[PDB]
Amino acid sequence: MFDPAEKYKMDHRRRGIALIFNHERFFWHLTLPERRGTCADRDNLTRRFSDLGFEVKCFNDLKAEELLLKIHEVSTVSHADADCFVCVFLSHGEGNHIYAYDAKIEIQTLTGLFKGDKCHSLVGKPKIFIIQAARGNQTNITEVDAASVYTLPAGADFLMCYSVAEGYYSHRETVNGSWYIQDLCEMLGKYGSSLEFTELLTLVNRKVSQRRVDFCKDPSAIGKKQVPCFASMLTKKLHFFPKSNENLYFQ
Amino acid sequence: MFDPAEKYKMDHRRRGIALIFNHERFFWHLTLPERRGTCADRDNLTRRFSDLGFEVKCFNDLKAEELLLKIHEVSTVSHADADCFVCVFLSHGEGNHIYAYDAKIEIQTLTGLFKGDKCHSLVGKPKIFIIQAARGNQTNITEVDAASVYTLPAGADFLMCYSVAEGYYSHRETVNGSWYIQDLCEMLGKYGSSLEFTELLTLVNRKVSQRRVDFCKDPSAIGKKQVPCFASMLTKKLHFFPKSNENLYFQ
Numbered sequence: 001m002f003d004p005a006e007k008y009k010m011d012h013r014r015r016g017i018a019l020i021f022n023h024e025r026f027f028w029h030l031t032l033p034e035r036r037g038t039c040a041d042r043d044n045l046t047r048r049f050s051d052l053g054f055e056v057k058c059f060n061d062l063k064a065e066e067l068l069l070k071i072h073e074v075s076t077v078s079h080a081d082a083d084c085f086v087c088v089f090l091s092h093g094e095g096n097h098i099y100a101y102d103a104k105i106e107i108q109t110l111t112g113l114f115k116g117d118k119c120h121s122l123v124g125k126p127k128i129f130i131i132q133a134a135r136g137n138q139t140n141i142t143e144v145d146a147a148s149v150y151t152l153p154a155g156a157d158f159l160m161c162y163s164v165a166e167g168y169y170s171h172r173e174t175v176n177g178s179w180y181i182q183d184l185c186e187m188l189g190k191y192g193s194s195l196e197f198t199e200l201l202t203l204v205n206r207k208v209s210q211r212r213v214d215f216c217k218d219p220s221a222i223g224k225k226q227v228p229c230f231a232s233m234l235t236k237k238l239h240f241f242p243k244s245n246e247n248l249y250f251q
Numbered sequence: 252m253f254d255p256a257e258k259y260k261m262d263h264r265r266r267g268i269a270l271i272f273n274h275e276r277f278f279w280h281l282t283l284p285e286r287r288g289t290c291a292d293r294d295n296l297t298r299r300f301s302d303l304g305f306e307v308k309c310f311n312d313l314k315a316e317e318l319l320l321k322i323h324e325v326s327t328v329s330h331a332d333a334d335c336f337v338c339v340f341l342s343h344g345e346g347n348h349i350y351a352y353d354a355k356i357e358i359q360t361l362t363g364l365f366k367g368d369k370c371h372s373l374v375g376k377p378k379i380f381i382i383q384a385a386r387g388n389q390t391n392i393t394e395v396d397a398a399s400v401y402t403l404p405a406g407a408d409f410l411m412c413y414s415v416a417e418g419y420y421s422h423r424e425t426v427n428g429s430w431y432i433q434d435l436c437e438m439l440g441k442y443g444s445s446l447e448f449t450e451l452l453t454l455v456n457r458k459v460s461q462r463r464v465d466f467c468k469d470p471s472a473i474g475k476k477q478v479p480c481f482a483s484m485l486t487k488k489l490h491f492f493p494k495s496n497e498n499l500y501f502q
């Protein structure tokens with residue numbers, strides 16, 4: 001009884017949690033620049049993930065110890081009554097690391113906490129990570145960073161989403177926020193509730209790839225294109241259709 | 252005039268070329284095992300890509316120099332009248348490398364030949380790489396290799412497809428061929444001509460992930476699951492609908 005149109009079960013009581021780790025400033029001795037505009041990203045994401053039924057939980061400028069505690073907490077709580085799990089990083093990164101305030105964390109140890117083995121309540125449910133992280137280079141200016149974070153997959157039923165691929169550049173407007181987040185959040189607003197999520201991420205790839213970078217206020221920023229990507233280990237179609245909440249306890 | 256259902260143009264005179272580099276044996280001094288069954292893979296792929304309209308070109312056990320010549324040839328010929336380009340590697344690999352017969356080749360230099368800059372006739376057309384490569388460990392037995400090849404994205408309008416992700420294992424039957432290729436080729440047969448290609452690759456992820464590995468003829472092969480993945484930098488939906496060939500020159 002094999003079904004080419006099989007969808008993840010998205011009929012649980014609650015949609016699930018969306019973590020957002022949001023990083024604007026860094027410990028002096030890391031020599032990483034302010035990510036001015038990351039609060040636009042955090043707020044835009046918070047709105048769009050809320051409207052899809054997520055319990056959004058934001059954390060600003062956590063040290064490694066605090067971050068590991070919050071994400072481990074969330075991994076060991078029960079997700080039994082939840083459709084899925086979303087985790088977002090807005091920071092600097094390098095290779096297989098994201099920056100917390102004070103030090104780098106191995107991405108594999110964060111995604112590892114939600115792998116079948118370690119988090120039973122999320123087995124066979126989609127686990128989406130969205131990563132807006134690049135190399136800190138050193139009114140509304142556009143800053144540009146070199147891609148730095150390996151666009152790795154995680155495990156079965158994960159979807160890893162990346163602002164930028166190897167050899168491209170990642171853009172953040174200091175008031176409007178990151179190109180990738182703006183375009184992801186626009187697409188979530190228009191199509192979040194109708195389109196399959198990889199269909200949508202493909203729209204985000206088109207939108208971001210088509211941002212022209214020929215006439216730029218900085219000369220050295222010209223020719224630096226942005227192409228995002230996603231690594232899918234999903235096994236079914238993923239939809240965020242409106243949940244029917246009429247005369248039901250959903251908290 | 253922005254279209255959430257935008258499809259790549261697949262109405263050119265010809266579908267395009269599908270290269271298949273097929274590697275069964277290796278130079279002694281590489282200490283890599285025979286990939287018994289890789290000819291089933293090559294033949295199964297050749298059939299299914301043909302039936303979708305591809306000019307399939309297979310090459311067996313090319314040395315690095317020969318392989319680079321054939322793939323550079325194909326990159327500098329015109330694809331102007333073609334929908335897309337498919338390239339398949341069936342070999343051993345490590346990190347960012349595939350093995351030819353005599354030495355390793357950097358995957359980036361092979362995908363690099365088809366990037367917009369270097370191959371104008373393929374700009375804005377999908378470029379699909381399928382990679383069945385793992386670590387050579389050292390009638391119909393199932394052999395099992397550790398994942399080894401980084402699941403890299405390439406550039407705009409590429410789709411990188413991988414037999415296996417980090418921490419999983421890749422299976423090849425010595426007569427029936429690789430689990431990944433069997434399941435990809437089954438899905439191409441049933442759904443190649445109807446389904447969006449990432450939709451299909453998701454079916455392949457389900458099919459391969461669901462192959463049970465609890466009761467195995469080798470004890471040490473038990474518990475070694477296989478989960479493939481794909482890295483999409485595609486900007487539109489990709490379909491291989493039957494081409495209208497009726498009273499038209501398609502050669």
Ligand SMILES: Oc1cc(F)ccc1CNc1ncccc1-c1c[nH]cn1
Pocket residue numbers: 150151152153398399400401402403404416417418
């Ligand atoms: O996907 C894998 C598979 C493995 F067998 C081992 C590690 C990984 C994850 N690492 C990466 N994943 C995506 C793009 C680049 C890299 C990378 C480049 N350099 C180091 N790592």
